[PDB]
Design an enzyme around this catalytic site. Structure first.
Site, PDB file in Angstrom:
ATOM      1  N   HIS A   1       0.852  -1.032   0.040  1.00  0.00           N
ATOM      2  CA  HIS A   1      -0.031   0.024  -0.077  1.00  0.00           C
ATOM      3  C   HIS A   1       1.011   1.307   0.010  1.00  0.00           C
ATOM      4  O   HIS A   1       2.223   1.236   0.085  1.00  0.00           O
ATOM      5  CB  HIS A   1      -0.734   0.204   1.427  1.00  0.00           C
ATOM      6  CG  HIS A   1      -1.801  -1.092   1.360  1.00  0.00           C
ATOM      7  ND1 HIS A   1      -2.914  -1.401   0.848  1.00  0.00           N
ATOM      8  CD2 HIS A   1      -1.515  -2.252   2.208  1.00  0.00           C
ATOM      9  CE1 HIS A   1      -3.635  -2.145   0.973  1.00  0.00           C
ATOM     10  NE2 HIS A   1      -2.915  -3.092   2.005  1.00  0.00           N
TER      11      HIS A   1
ATOM     12  N   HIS B   1      -5.750   9.186  -1.165  1.00  0.00           N
ATOM     13  CA  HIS B   1      -6.013   7.732  -1.421  1.00  0.00           C
ATOM     14  C   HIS B   1      -4.696   7.014  -1.671  1.00  0.00           C
ATOM     15  O   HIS B   1      -3.667   7.515  -2.139  1.00  0.00           O
ATOM     16  CB  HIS B   1      -6.960   7.677  -2.555  1.00  0.00           C
ATOM     17  CG  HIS B   1      -6.423   8.222  -3.869  1.00  0.00           C
ATOM     18  ND1 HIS B   1      -5.726   7.416  -4.757  1.00  0.00           N
ATOM     19  CD2 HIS B   1      -6.364   9.257  -4.406  1.00  0.00           C
ATOM     20  CE1 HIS B   1      -5.374   8.211  -5.610  1.00  0.00           C
ATOM     21  NE2 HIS B   1      -5.849   9.682  -5.671  1.00  0.00           N
TER      22      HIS B   1
ATOM     23  N   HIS C   1      -7.575  -0.521  -5.029  1.00  0.00           N
ATOM     24  CA  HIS C   1      -7.423  -0.165  -3.806  1.00  0.00           C
ATOM     25  C   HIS C   1      -8.602   0.884  -3.272  1.00  0.00           C
ATOM     26  O   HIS C   1      -8.996   0.896  -2.324  1.00  0.00           O
ATOM     27  CB  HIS C   1      -5.985   0.385  -3.483  1.00  0.00           C
ATOM     28  CG  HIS C   1      -4.981  -0.933  -3.410  1.00  0.00           C
ATOM     29  ND1 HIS C   1      -4.148  -1.244  -2.221  1.00  0.00           N
ATOM     30  CD2 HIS C   1      -4.895  -1.960  -4.292  1.00  0.00           C
ATOM     31  CE1 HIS C   1      -3.520  -2.088  -2.405  1.00  0.00           C
ATOM     32  NE2 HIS C   1      -3.853  -2.679  -3.617  1.00  0.00           N
TER      33      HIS C   1
ATOM     34  N   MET D   1     -10.099   2.369   0.327  1.00  0.00           N
ATOM     35  CA  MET D   1      -8.778   3.080   0.702  1.00  0.00           C
ATOM     36  C   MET D   1      -8.563   4.659   0.333  1.00  0.00           C
ATOM     37  O   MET D   1      -7.746   4.915  -0.370  1.00  0.00           O
ATOM     38  CB  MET D   1      -7.633   2.250   0.257  1.00  0.00           C
ATOM     39  CG  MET D   1      -6.416   2.350   1.417  1.00  0.00           C
ATOM     40  SD  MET D   1      -5.346   0.912   1.176  1.00  0.00           S
ATOM     41  CE  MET D   1      -4.290   1.377   2.596  1.00  0.00           C
TER      42      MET D   1
ATOM     43  N   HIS E   1     -27.100  16.755  -1.334  1.00  0.00           N
ATOM     44  CA  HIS E   1     -28.351  17.634  -1.031  1.00  0.00           C
ATOM     45  C   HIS E   1     -29.043  17.427   0.333  1.00  0.00           C
ATOM     46  O   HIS E   1     -28.902  16.325   0.849  1.00  0.00           O
ATOM     47  CB  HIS E   1     -29.415  17.157  -2.156  1.00  0.00           C
ATOM     48  CG  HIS E   1     -30.687  17.912  -1.829  1.00  0.00           C
ATOM     49  ND1 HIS E   1     -30.998  19.294  -2.727  1.00  0.00           N
ATOM     50  CD2 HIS E   1     -31.743  17.881  -1.042  1.00  0.00           C
ATOM     51  CE1 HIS E   1     -32.247  19.803  -2.356  1.00  0.00           C
ATOM     52  NE2 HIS E   1     -32.664  19.095  -1.318  1.00  0.00           N
TER      53      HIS E   1
ATOM     54  N   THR F   1     -28.366  21.846  -4.708  1.00  0.00           N
ATOM     55  CA  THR F   1     -27.619  20.504  -4.690  1.00  0.00           C
ATOM     56  C   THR F   1     -26.276  21.276  -5.452  1.00  0.00           C
ATOM     57  O   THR F   1     -26.445  22.056  -6.219  1.00  0.00           O
ATOM     58  CB  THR F   1     -28.459  19.507  -5.777  1.00  0.00           C
ATOM     59  OG1 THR F   1     -29.534  19.361  -5.256  1.00  0.00           O
ATOM     60  CG2 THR F   1     -27.577  18.516  -5.922  1.00  0.00           C
TER      61      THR F   1
ATOM     62  N   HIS G   1     -28.111  13.059  -4.664  1.00  0.00           N
ATOM     63  CA  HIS G   1     -29.439  13.257  -5.411  1.00  0.00           C
ATOM     64  C   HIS G   1     -29.574  12.594  -6.207  1.00  0.00           C
ATOM     65  O   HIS G   1     -30.794  13.111  -7.383  1.00  0.00           O
ATOM     66  CB  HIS G   1     -29.848  14.881  -5.517  1.00  0.00           C
ATOM     67  CG  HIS G   1     -31.232  15.220  -5.136  1.00  0.00           C
ATOM     68  ND1 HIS G   1     -32.168  14.919  -6.301  1.00  0.00           N
ATOM     69  CD2 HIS G   1     -31.887  15.717  -4.180  1.00  0.00           C
ATOM     70  CE1 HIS G   1     -33.424  15.074  -5.866  1.00  0.00           C
ATOM     71  NE2 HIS G   1     -33.377  15.637  -4.441  1.00  0.00           N
TER      72      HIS G   1
HETATM   73 CU   LIG Z   1      -3.782   0.345  -0.599  1.00  0.00          CU
HETATM   74 CU   LIG Z   2      -5.745  11.031  -7.155  1.00  0.00          CU
HETATM   75 CU   LIG Z   3     -34.938  16.368  -3.299  1.00  0.00          CU
END
Ligand SMILES: [Cu+2]
Ligand SMILES: [Cu+2]
Ligand SMILES: [Cu+2]
Ligand SMILES: [Cu+2]
Ligand SMILES: [Cu+2]
Ligand SMILES: [Cu+2]
Lengths: 333, 333, 333
Positions: free
Chosen positions: A88, A128, A138, A143, A248, A273, A299
């Site tokens: 990771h 991320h 991932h 993640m 929303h 929204t 929404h």
């Molecule tokens: Cu990862």
């Molecule tokens: Cu990115």
């Molecule tokens: Cu609505």
């Protein structure tokens, strides 16, 4: 220079809650230290008991929200325990260089690393995992998270006036692509890797099977509904690392909204929204004026009520009849 | 207080047309009264005769556009005749509290109710049915519309200067999810409820079968094309209660656009195409400079020309050769 | 009048490169002449050798980027050689009238035409083929590009200050819908028309099989990666004629962004990711601060890494440890 800067260590808290911080910086720039532990774990995401093998930052989906101030230095200690099975890393959309840090933070199980970067731009950003060759896998396994870089003098409205929130919540929206069999039932796996080949095929359909807030259908409802009171100013941070969403507040509005989440820009006013693009974090500020239950939703109502992207806000206080009133209660013609 | 305010009753008209109103308010705040009747009815949406059981506000898809001014009080009498089979309600994105009024307007067939709310924020907003448990089903069955809350001094451009339209049209875009059989043919039902189970399965695919303007494929074409003349300033209100859309006027532009439809914000200028998020209403202002036919479309051209999201504008006047001219007509090399 | 204006002929170059031009106009308005030849040709779009019959402007996907200044007159000579099999035309989102010119430029194989239009609005715009009855088919076959209309005094920031780029690149993103058989393999055709019926069915799924930059998976990687140096100001023009995209520079930001691409509007600052609506062209300005490889992607990571919407930026220069540094390299706990 940096050796000379003061350092403070902060302990993260589980979403939707946010760790203690000051809106208006009371000190000069500092080195803010955080520690996160990667955790591959099984998670059941719906009422039928559908189980997945999630890849998390600190054991939660989304990962915790980090809060610092513009020009502070973020120092993260990333640990990948030997109990995990995959490699990771971490990519901060808030950082400059080396793929947001992804190229400098590759850790195999049993490894750890420490990255430091300068938070040069204010706003809310997505962070991320992004390992070469399996980035979407991932990311769509949970993640990802977000980091907020507040201007040193806090938030301001379109006219440069101070905006102060009483409460802040972090809503992480996650799209999941659970592999299914011929009849449409979800498949179950023993280990994350045993799901890989199937996972890739499910992602290519571009159709999520679940879209949830805080890691599961109904996670922000019932006893876990978000709370506020009439008169309270609330800041809601919302992120989506892979797919577009359109938040929303049913019964309310976004008084001041930074849809693409960058504070150097003036906010949009009175939004009903707003669109948060996949791979972005946004923030909405609202002052509650009526008590009762509010439905905070993506929404596209199918994604909200059929797939899981819906949460609750429970607000206390006195009802304002000037704003709204039932003149004639539902009755037989 | 309210008892002391003047009251005016307005009769709604069928989309794309809009009821009479004043851009710049000539009176002080008032109680504006509207009456809408819910109507569940069969509608054929395409040239092949595909029929559906639509759920409508006042017998149309979209529901009619309501127009009031900031700080006016909207009083709606909602009637659900006993000829209908389902419970319905109304959620105004323009209102504050009780799910936009949805929690105060639940009416079973044979019932009616009257709701009043203060229009505190200017802009165009979506209103839609939202009954607990079957929100997306009612919304994607055509049960949504829009309301426009004009600033008391009318619209203004990015520099605070007055913007006055000569014509206004309301285009409601609707995504439909018609259940299909094994071969791909659309299924037909006797009653709305007989379609429920199938409807839910079709929605979960997140793939519409039809995306139309004004309730049907080609509804705003031929004899029903929208009309204008060179020199006329037109305001086009566009809404999508469930899905994102990207309006575009082929051959023209959006001189002043409020993509997310809130007038307290300055408009975006010279837009070629703009994004209206699902669950939002937007408005575009344009002054026609050339005569001829214009294609008003959702610019995902597959959705426009294969699914139905396309309409026509027919403009009269003199052609301007300075703006455009064919120097050499198509001829053999 | 026009007869009296100076005329200059420009030769287009292949994307992602852009033809020579001046940011700040050094002359008064002119008639800028361009020549484009339509070319229907086979193109292999992925590593497995998937082949399609592309419809191109000047032999490339996307078509070349045209650059002129506000109020200049664009004169295009469009040629459709007799070696082609279909009728084509061109619709400039930058032009006013006759469907952007589409109604005046219909040319059958063996025909040519010349259109002239006044570039009255500054910004980056999409241009695309739009023949009545098969618009989406031609557009999603690669027949689209973009034109940039620069203000006569160049670009400016949110405060009216001059923005000058050292390098400019044009990234055209294309969604493809390749027909597949029962097992999921792509079908191959001898002629464009032999694919028509199948093409329509594939488009209706609304699910692309490939989403690429510059006509193919990995086209802007390896030896074809985009290049820059630390300190260089780069302008990246990005267009999508049919589908929404959300560009993001992994490791960087969009210092100044015009998401919907119209320069009369102030740019958005410090963007992490921005939304470019289908049928629009946008532009992002960034000054590189760190050397290394950057991943320029559509941030729906599935579309980026599984479908092909990802490119590389290779930047030279000295690493800045203040901005980012690995305090503790990945090591065993
Ligand atoms: Cu990862
Ligand atoms: Cu990115
Ligand atoms: Cu609505
Ligand atoms: Cu209803
Ligand atoms: Cu177009
Ligand atoms: Cu063509």
């Amino acid at each position: 220079d940096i050796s000379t800067l003061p350092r403070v260590k902060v302990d993260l808290v589980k979403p939707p809650f946010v760790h203690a911080h000051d809106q208006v910086a009371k000190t000069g720039p500092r080195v803010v230290e955080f520690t996160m532990t990667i955790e591959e774990k099984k998670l059941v995401i719906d009422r039928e008991g559908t189980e997945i093998h999630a890849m998390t930052f600190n054991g939660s989906v989304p990962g915790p929200l980090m809060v610092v101030h513009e020009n502070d230095y973020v120092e993260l200690r990333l640990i990948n325990p030997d109990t995990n099975t995959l490699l990771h890393n971490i990519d901060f959309h808030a950082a400059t260089g080396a793929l947001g840090g992804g190229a400098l933070t590759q850790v195999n199980p049993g490894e750890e690393t420490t990255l430091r970067f300068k938070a040069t731009k204010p706003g809310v950003f997505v962070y991320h995992c992004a390992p070469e060759g399996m980035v979407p896998w991932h990311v769509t396994s949970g993640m990802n998270g977000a980091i907020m870089v507040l201007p040193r003098d806090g938030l301001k409205d379109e006219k440069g006036q101070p905006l102060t929130y009483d409460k802040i919540y972090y809503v992480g929206e996650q799209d999941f692509y659970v592999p299914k069999d011929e009849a449409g039932n979800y498949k179950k796996y023993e280990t994350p890797g045993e799901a890989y080949e199937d996972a890739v095929k499910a992602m290519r359909t571009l159709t999520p099977t679940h879209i949830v807030f805080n890691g599961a259908v109904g996670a922000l409802t019932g006893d876990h509904a978000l709370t506020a009171a009439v008169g309270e100013r609330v800041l809601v941070v919302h992120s989506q690392a892979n797919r577009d969403t359109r938040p929303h507040l049913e019964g309310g509005h976004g008084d001041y909204v930074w849809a693409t989440g960058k504070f150097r820009n003036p906010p949009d006013l009175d939004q009903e929204t707003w669109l948060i693009p996949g791979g972005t974090a946004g923030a909405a500020f609202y002052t509650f004026r009526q008590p009762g239950v509010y439905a905070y939703v993506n929404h596209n109502l199918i994604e909200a009520f059929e797939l899981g992207a819906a949460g609750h806000f429970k607000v206390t206080g006195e009802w304002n009849d000037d704003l709204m009133t039932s003149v004639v209660k539902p009755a037989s013609m």
